């Protein structure tokens, strides 16, 4: 007679989850764990309740110099990260260059809030013309205008006396100071605007020892202008002073930026704009809300994020090979 039996066996179910191995692909297993997040909400959200600075059609230079088409950002509140488009149309309205621009953007990556302060009043130029430095290249409401945070000074009564101005940073925070120089089209324009034929702009702090000289050249018209504006910046430390001296072509500071909050930020390149949402992990393509340890959305993220990999699939086997 057949005796009693005991059998050893293993679990099986109707799972269709598959994993790969070195020697075999698409192994159906009873249990598996997906570890790759592949979904995002396609929106730019606040980072832990802090709204980002979304520059829209303005560049960082257009914001900081005060392109008159960027009045939305004349005084911005604290931000969590900055969003800039690939090619913002509102940049240097008057054409030219921004010296060490990428180094300044790198500095911005560690700043969360500016406070704009007037360091040199536009009305304090008693020996120079301070209200004629406007151009059709920088329109505001149909009128010729200019960058709002600097002043394009012009000769007064056919004379341009030597400017000697100082600003002492009596604040407790670092100060981002911006100024510029005008490179005119020819010697005739040099005489017409500044009278003096040979000019300079000397700038000094405890560390800065600068002397700019205008470069006259014949150039292609950009935004209708063949002249150029070249802008320079420095970080003025507390209790340090900045000294300007110039006999022409000076694009003087009016407003500077106190660095009132430092922290972890970034300049995210994205064509998206505000999505009226909140998140813990932000990418240029959208926000991530996930418990997965990995994601493949975008390598440049900010916040508490999973680790980025280029994988299209990452599935760990947890159970055993599933019997059909």
């Amino acid at each position: 007679d057949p005796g009693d039996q005991i059998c050893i066996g293993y679990h099986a179910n109707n799972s269709t989850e598959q994993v790969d191995t070195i020697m075999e692909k698409n192994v159906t297993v009873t249990h598996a764990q997906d570890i790759l997040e592949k979904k995002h909400n396609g929106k730019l959200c606040d980072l832990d309740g802090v709204k980002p600075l979304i520059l829209r059609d303005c560049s960082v230079a257009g914001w900081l110099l005060g392109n008159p088409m960027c009045d939305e950002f004349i005084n911005v509140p604290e931000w969590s990260y900055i969003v800039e488009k690939a090619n913002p149309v509102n940049d240097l309205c008057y054409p030219g260059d921004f010296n060490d621009y990428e180094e300044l953007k790198h500095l911005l990556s560690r700043i969360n809030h500016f406070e704009k302060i007037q360091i040199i009043p536009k009305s304090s130029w008693s020996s120079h013309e301070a209200s004629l430095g406007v151009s059709s290249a920088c329109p505001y409401q149909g009128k010729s205008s200019f960058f709002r945070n600097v002043v394009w000074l012009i000769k007064k009564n056919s004379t341009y006396p030597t400017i000697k101005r100082s600003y002492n940073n009596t604040n407790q925070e670092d100060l981002l100071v911006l100024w510029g120089i005008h490179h005119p089209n020819d010697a005739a324009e040099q005489t017409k605007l500044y009278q003096n034929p040979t000019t300079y702009i000397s700038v000094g702090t405890s560390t800065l020892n600068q002397r700019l000289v205008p470069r006259i050249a014949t150039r292609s018209k950009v935004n209708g202008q063949s002249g150029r504006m070249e802008f320079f910046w420095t970080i003025l430390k507390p209790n340090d002073a900045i000294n300007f001296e110039s006999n022409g072509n000076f694009i003087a500071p009016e407003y500077a930026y106190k660095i009132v909050k430092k922290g972890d930020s970034t300049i995210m390149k994205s064509e998206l704009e505000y999505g009226n949402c909140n998140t813990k992990c932000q990418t240029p393509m959208g926000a991530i809300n996930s418990s997965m340890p990995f994601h493949n959305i975008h390598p440049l993220t900010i916040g508490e994020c999973p680790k980025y990999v280029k994988s299209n699939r990452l599935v760990l086997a947890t159970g055993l090979r599933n019997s059909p």
Partner: protein, 176 residues
């Protein structure tokens, strides 16, 4: 598989065993049924959980890309930056994908080994008191009630308690 148990001498799994990864099916006079082996199942659960957590934690210190910008006369360093970031991303993608592949193989073989070890545990308990059928089952030479089955399942089977009955049955079978 490497250990010849899963889809080996045990052709297939049991849909009827839901409360565990490995276990037993018994059949005696009092009836038949499934019973998951708690100890091996829990050891496998602990092993697999620790494995997943170890993989995740070993990817704790992977490269994090940082946005950097360069002007039109910094193309060499811009290209260097791009190649550096892409290179690290490729290295860590390779690490993740390869580790997942290798540990998936090891996990499947680990389940196979656990099944084989459970089978061998029962086999070395029973010895010649039961006959190896070759399909994962043992046919007892003696009566094995539910308490006997449980003694087999928990590893406390008493061979001398049934050795004489098994010897009588074996002699009856061998004598034809």
């Amino acid at each position: 598989g490497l250990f010849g148990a899963i889809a080996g001498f045990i052709e297939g799994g049991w849909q009827g065993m839901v409360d565990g990864w490995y276990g037993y099916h018994h059949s005696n006079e009092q009836g038949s049924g499934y019973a998951a082996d708690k100890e091996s199942t829990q050891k496998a659960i602990d092993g697999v959980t620790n494995k997943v957590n170890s993989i995740i934690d070993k990817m704790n210190t992977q490269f994090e890309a940082v946005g950097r910008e360069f002007n039109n006369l910094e193309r060499r360093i811009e290209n260097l930056n791009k190649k550096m970031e892409d290179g690290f991303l490729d290295v860590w993608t390779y690490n993740a994908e390869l580790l997942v592949l290798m540990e998936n193989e090891r996990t499947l073989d680990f389940h196979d080994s656990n099944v084989k070890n459970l089978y061998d545990k029962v086999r070395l308990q029973l010895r010649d008191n039961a006959k190896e059928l070759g399909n994962g089952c043992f046919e007892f030479y003696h009566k094995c009630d539910n308490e006997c089955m449980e003694s087999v399942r928990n590893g406390t089977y008493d061979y001398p308690q049934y050795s004489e009955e098994a010897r009588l049955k074996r002699e009856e079978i061998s004598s034809g």
